[PDB]
């Protein structure tokens, strides 16, 4: 991932009043994935047949 000049200039402080970037800003990256699974029901029990 490539950042932006706006991000690199807002990372430092120097912003005026009611600017949001008056204080130094810190950022984090989050990644989510949605996957498939199979559940087997037998003998009154629930468990993954493939783990």
């Amino acid at each position: 991932v490539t950042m932006s000049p706006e991000s690199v200039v807002a990372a430092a402080g120097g912003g005026n009043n009611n600017s949001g970037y008056n204080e130094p800003q810190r950022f984090a990256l989050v990644v989510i994935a949605v996957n498939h699974n199979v559940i087997r029901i037998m003998n009154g029990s629930m468990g993954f047949p493939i783990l």
Binding site: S45, M46, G47, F48, P49, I50, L51
Partner: protein, 51 residues
């Protein structure tokens, strides 16, 4: 006198009886093995300059 469909409550069955909890299936995927071996170094028994 009032007539209506009689209310019948199903019965029997069994709930929360003799918990077992054995659904796990062993097995996983990872590396196979490693092809590494070594010899018994090198011996040296020679002197006297026998040509």
């Amino acid at each position: 006198i009032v007539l209506r469909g009689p209310t019948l409550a199903p019965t029997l069955d069994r709930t929360a009886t003799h918990t077992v909890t054995r659904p796990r299936a062993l097995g996983s995927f990872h590396s196979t093995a490693g092809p590494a071996k070594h010899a018994a170094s090198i011996m040296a028994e020679c002197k006297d300059e026998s040509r």
